[PDB]
Design a binder for this molecule. Structure first.
Ligand SMILES: OC[C@H]1O[C@@](CO)(O[C@H]2O[C@H](CO)[C@@H](O)[C@H](O)[C@H]2O)[C@@H](O)[C@@H]1O
Ligand SMILES: OC[C@H]1O[C@@](CO)(O[C@H]2O[C@H](CO)[C@@H](O)[C@H](O)[C@H]2O)[C@@H](O)[C@@H]1O
Ligand SMILES: [Mg+2]
Length: 580
DNA sequence: GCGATCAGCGG
DNA sequence: TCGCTGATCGCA
């Protein structure tokens, strides 16, 4: 059954055809400055395996890799591109990426290796990566014979599957989505990850010391108030002190025991002084453990930079995710945690951080897709949307909107943006499910177009089996027909929400591609560093700020044309914290 | 070691 | 609402 192939000791001309399935294997999950364990090439002349030290040192092979006219079909080309970037080798001409193709066809499949993608087309002549490399502490690169056959079989699958995947994408009207959006974006993400973000470790270390001192004081205060020492970070141990020793009331319970979440504690504060201290301890501890220590653990000692990895093929909405470290959830709401951002600095002297974010892109997209007259007019007037929503839902003038009214209207808008259940709205507003649903009803009365869209999209999801975004991204919702209320209701909320969140994702992704092209045309040194859902973070010489103030918002605002304007706010400063 | 649990951060 | 990471704790 074995697959035939040449275990080459040297690179030959037939290995450099102008079209080929290419495998540049990087086994380590985090591919930054990681080893390339083997190479495989499948083209019209046959199948080949090349040892990396051999191929990567060969002038002809390197040139072939960097020749844009020599087309390669791969799986997760960003992984290979970045690993090659760390070795000073440019990878060009990738015309097809099976990972991105499979992702667009059905993000719910969770395709994470060639075998999984291949199974979509009943092709099983390739093993899953885990079966070959194992997992966890037992993970390891096998002997050359085993490794070589695996890489060749993966290349062979890619070679065979390109056609059927492109054919289905075309049928789904997603061919341009792959070739003009995701694949070009993949190269941009590769550049961003490789560039990395400079971190002021001394600053982070000082904050750590400060936090350590405050945690110590609060910790002792907690033991003092509890009358004994215990592991505060143990919900189980904490639950005993709180609901058994101190007798505080049990307002919420978890599947395994007493709930000790912040929202619960907030309500118990009045009963005992220990509660506020536990809340303070949770805050400080979160910062120390997750943001100070967690960040310091992944900073590269030699360059003092963190090189995140953007997972371009994970979410069912089309949004990107970030890991090692996750730079999409750095504190900002609370001033104490916000200061963490002072640690993210420009990578060069006299450079600054420039941040631009879309203002309410999700609600603007909703106004566009639902064609709601009231919502469109609100944005055409660039009104404060939360105040406007309050005015309509509570039937009052602008002057009559109180701070609490706006907060609740903002919470309602949030629930719409993220498609949360009428139950989740109650939890956030600390009100009853009945009252939460009551607000929703009032919202739809004020925004009849949105109500019509919500009803129509659910019916469409049921009829077609999926929902789509502005750029044709798709999400299958099989649960839309379930006779289980909660399961069905969630599917309905995803039907409503995906076109909103997903279209916003499409827009920012296109903006990134457009921005990179403009920066190059303008010969600016400025470059993208991070993307955080609705915002783009760049760094550039201080001499380029004025031009960026005009260029960045314009490019982002014109990425697509909607029935309402797109608005982009921007700031810049010495640190990410200052780009405020 | 590993996965389940619970917790909290952003958009 | 999700995707991420970290501390704890039962099972191995
Ligand atoms: O290279 C990223 C790419 O690889 C996948 C697997 O095909 O994820 C792997 O790498 C990520 C970044 O290190 C890890 O978070 C993940 O656990 C690991 O399996 C894809 O999901 C991703 O698009
Ligand atoms: O000091 C370590 C020792 O204290 C306990 C409580 O008896 O836990 C404390 O310290 C941990 C590490 O800093 C925290 O995670 C925990 O929240 C705090 O109460 C013991 O578990 C530990 O052996
Ligand atoms: Mg914003």
């Amino acid at each position: 059954a074995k697959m035939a192939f040449t275990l080459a000791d040297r690179v030959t001309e037939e290995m450099l055809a102008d079209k080929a399935a290419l495998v540049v294997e990087v086994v380590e999950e985090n591919y930054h400055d990681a080893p390339i364990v083997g190479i495989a090439v499948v083209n019209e002349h046959g199948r080949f395996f090349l040892r990396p030290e051999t191929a990567l040192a060969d002038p002809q092979f390197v040139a072939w890799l960097g020749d844009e006219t020599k087309k390669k079909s791969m799986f997760d080309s960003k992984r290979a591109a970045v690993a090659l970037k760390w070795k000073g080798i440019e990878l060009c001409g990738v015309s097809f990426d099976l990972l991105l193709a499979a992702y667009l066809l059905d993000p719910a499949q969770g395709v994470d290796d060639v075998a999984a993608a291949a199974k979509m087309k009943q092709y099983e002549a390739v093993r899953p990566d885990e079966a070959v490399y194992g997992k966890g502490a037992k993970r390891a690169v096998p002997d050359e014979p085993v490794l070589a056959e695996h890489l060749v079989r993966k290349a062979a699958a890619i070679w065979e599957l390109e056609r059927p995947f492109l054919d289905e994408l075309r049928r789904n009207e997603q061919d341009r989505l792959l070739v003009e959006l995701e694949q070009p974006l993949s190269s941009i993400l590769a550049e961003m990850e490789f560039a990395g973000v400079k971190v002021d470790t001394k600053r982070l270390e000082q904050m750590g010391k400060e936090l350590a001192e405050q945690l110590g004081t609060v910790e002792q205060r907690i033991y003092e108030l509890a009358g004994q020492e215990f592991n505060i970070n143990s919900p189980k141990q904490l639950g005993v002190i709180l609901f058994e020793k101190l007798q505080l009331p049990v307002l919420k319970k978890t599947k395994t025991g007493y709930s000790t979440s912040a929202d619960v504690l907030e309500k118990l504060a009045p009963y005992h002084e220990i509660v506020e201290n536990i809340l303070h301890y949770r805050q400080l501890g979160k910062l120390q453990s997750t943001y100070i220590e967690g960040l310091l653990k992944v900073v590269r000692p030699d360059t003092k930079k963190v090189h995140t990895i953007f997972n371009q093929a994970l979410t069912q909405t089309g949004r990107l995710s970030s890991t090692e470290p996750n730079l999409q959830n750095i504190p900002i709401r609370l001033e104490e945690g916000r200061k963490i951002r002072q640690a993210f600095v420009p990578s060069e002297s006299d450079w600054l951080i420039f941040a631009a974010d879309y203002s309410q892109i999700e609600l603007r997209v909703l106004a566009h897709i639902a064609e709601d007259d009231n919502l469109m007019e609100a944005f055409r007037r660039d009104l404060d949307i939360h105040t406007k929503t309050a005015m309509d839902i509570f039937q009052v003038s602008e002057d009559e909107v109180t701070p609490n009214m706006r907060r609740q209207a903002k919470a309602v808008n949030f629930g719409i943006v993220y498609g949360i259940s009428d139950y989740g709205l109650a939890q956030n507003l600390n009100i009853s499910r009945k009252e939460a649903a009551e607000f929703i009803e009032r919202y739809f009365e004020s925004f009849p177009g949105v109500k019509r869209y919500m009803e129509n999209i659910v019916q469409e999801a049921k009829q077609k089996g999926y929902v789509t975004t502005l750029l044709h991204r798709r999400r299958y919702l099989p649960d839309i027909t379930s006779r289980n209320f909660n399961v069905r209701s969630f599917a309905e909320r995803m039907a409503m929400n995906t076109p909103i969140q997903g279209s916003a994702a499409d827009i920012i992704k296109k903006a990134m591609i457009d921005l990179n092209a403009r920066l190059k045309e303008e010969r600016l040194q400025a470059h993208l560093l991070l993307q955080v859902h609705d915002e783009l973070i760049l760094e550039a010489p201080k001499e380029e700020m004025e031009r960026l103030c005009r260029l960045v918002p314009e490019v982002m605002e014109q990425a697509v044309t909607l029935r309402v304007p797109l608005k982009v706010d921007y700031h810049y400063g010495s640190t990410w914290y200052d780009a405020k």
